Write an enzyme that holds these catalytic residues in place. Structure first.
Site, mmCIF file in Angstrom:
data_model
loop_
_atom_site.group_PDB
_atom_site.id
_atom_site.type_symbol
_atom_site.label_atom_id
_atom_site.label_comp_id
_atom_site.label_asym_id
_atom_site.label_seq_id
_atom_site.Cartn_x
_atom_site.Cartn_y
_atom_site.Cartn_z
ATOM 1 N N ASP A 1 33.626 39.430 29.735
ATOM 2 C CA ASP A 1 35.172 39.486 30.117
ATOM 3 C C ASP A 1 33.857 38.549 31.971
ATOM 4 O O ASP A 1 33.670 39.353 33.161
ATOM 5 C CB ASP A 1 35.660 40.478 30.584
ATOM 6 C CG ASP A 1 36.783 40.054 31.539
ATOM 7 O OD1 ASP A 1 36.635 39.162 32.268
ATOM 8 O OD2 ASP A 1 37.381 41.088 31.939
ATOM 9 N N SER B 1 36.711 22.248 41.134
ATOM 10 C CA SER B 1 37.079 21.408 40.032
ATOM 11 C C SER B 1 37.422 20.450 40.962
ATOM 12 O O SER B 1 38.656 20.308 42.373
ATOM 13 C CB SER B 1 38.316 21.770 39.000
ATOM 14 O OG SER B 1 38.568 20.572 38.683
HETATM 15 N N1 LIG Z 1 39.679 38.683 33.714
HETATM 16 C C1 LIG Z 1 40.019 40.037 34.333
HETATM 17 N N2 LIG Z 1 39.533 40.650 33.958
HETATM 18 S S1 LIG Z 1 40.790 39.407 36.169
HETATM 19 C C2 LIG Z 1 41.057 37.960 35.549
HETATM 20 C C3 LIG Z 1 42.105 37.782 37.004
HETATM 21 C C4 LIG Z 1 43.183 37.694 36.725
HETATM 22 C C5 LIG Z 1 44.245 37.596 38.375
HETATM 23 C C6 LIG Z 1 43.351 37.608 39.693
HETATM 24 CL CL1 LIG Z 1 44.504 37.891 40.875
HETATM 25 C C7 LIG Z 1 42.125 37.646 39.566
HETATM 26 C C8 LIG Z 1 41.214 37.884 38.382
#
Ligand SMILES: N=C(N)SCc1ccc(Cl)cc1
Length: 330
Positions: A35, A199
């Site tokens: 991740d 991007s």
């Molecule tokens: N990939 C993860 N563990 S969280 C990704 C994410 C989703 C929303 C926001 Cl605000 C920030 C990061």
């Protein structure tokens, strides 16, 4: 040193990808979700509430001769879907694809939320964002990449996710046979702890490219592509019958549709996501309404280049002193 491990979709929709990881001595192999949007390495374990384990492989630190409790340390994290987990912490030996880190913080889950329990294929997460996001308290811990970095031939890892097929995570080297053309590198801001980049724009199908800055994160732990509402509306307007459904929770489209591709800019380069990559199948079993793989980021607060986008590219996570991101077609 280097490492190389195969990553495999957990299901027929590419909802997430799992990569085998060896933890402890003797090795206990768990299948973890790599991740790049978080920074904790956590696992289902012998400490996880029994009713919250349903088919996952668990880490048992008492069976590892190299495990040591990190005294007083706890962790607790939430994810973009509202899932969460928490527990205590060991250090142990962790290997990925032949690359070994000793003294890696392995966060042992005492509690996980229902969505983790319900997913029998994911034994935990391995975070690859910046260590500033790590949730261990009172002493923040380093990611696997951060610990490995100084030993690596080059301070990089690469993500090469497959569409309905396995792919590869490499550490410490760039496989020049794994992509076509050249890799285009682009600046990263680490200020929020993510692989955040901008991007240069987009195109829908064979349409003209719109030059526009889109700031977002390269996130292997997010399934879909989340972009500004204007961009997403422009995409789905090219699909007959597509609509945003509040009851379903995003854009849906007739399963009989042929989806257009979506192109995103990386500097002067272009990555083309084939239309098929944007189909996430029936909203429920037997339905002729299908869920879209491009969705609005409005309300999230950030744009997210998740698996839908990343799987269309060979992606370099360059952890040099000034980090950058590289994208190539493949
Ligand atoms: N990939 C993860 N563990 S969280 C990704 C994410 C989703 C929303 C926001 Cl605000 C920030 C990061």
């Amino acid at each position: 040193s280097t490492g190389s491990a195969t990553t495999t979709p957990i299901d027929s929709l590419d909802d997430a990808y799992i990569t085998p990881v060896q933890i402890g001595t003797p090795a206990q192999t768990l299948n973890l979700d790599f991740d790049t949007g978080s920074s904790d390495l956590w696992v289902f374990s012998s400490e996880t509430t029994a009713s919250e384990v349903d088919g996952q492989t668990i880490y048992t630190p008492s069976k590892s001769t190299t495990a040591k409790l990190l005294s007083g340390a706890t962790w607790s994290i939430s994810y973009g879907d509202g899932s969460s987990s928490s527990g205590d912490v060991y250090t142990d030996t962790v290997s990925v694809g032949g690359l070994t880190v000793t003294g890696q913080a392995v966060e042992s889950a005492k509690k996980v939320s229902s969505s983790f329990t319900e997913d029998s294929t994911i034994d935990g997460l391995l975070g690859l964002a910046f260590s500033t996001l790590n949730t261990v308290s009172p002493t923040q811990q380093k990611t696997f990449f951060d610990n490995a970095k100084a030993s690596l031939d080059s301070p990089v890892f690469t993500a090469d996710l497959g569409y309905h097929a396995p792919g590869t995570y490499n550490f410490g080297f760039i496989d020049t046979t794994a992509y076509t053309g050249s890799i285009t590198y682009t600046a990263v801001s680490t200020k929020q702890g993510f692989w955040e980049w901008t991007s240069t724009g987009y195109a829908v199908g064979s349409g003209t490219f719109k030059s526009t800055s889109i700031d977002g994160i390269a996130d292997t732990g997010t399934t879909l592509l989340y972009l500004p509402a204007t961009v997403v509306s422009a995409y789905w307007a090219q699909v007959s019958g597509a609509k945003s459904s509040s009851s379903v929770g995003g854009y849906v489209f007739p399963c009989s549709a042929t989806l257009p591709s979506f192109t995103f800019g990386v500097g002067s380069a272009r990555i083309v996501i084939p239309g098929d990559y944007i189909d996430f199948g029936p909203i429920s079993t037997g339905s002729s309404s299908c869920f879209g793989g491009i969705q609005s980021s409005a309300g999230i607060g950030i744009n997210i280049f998740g698996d839908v986008a990343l799987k269309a590219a060979f992606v370099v996570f360059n952890g040099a002193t000034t980090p950058t991101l590289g994208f190539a077609s493949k």
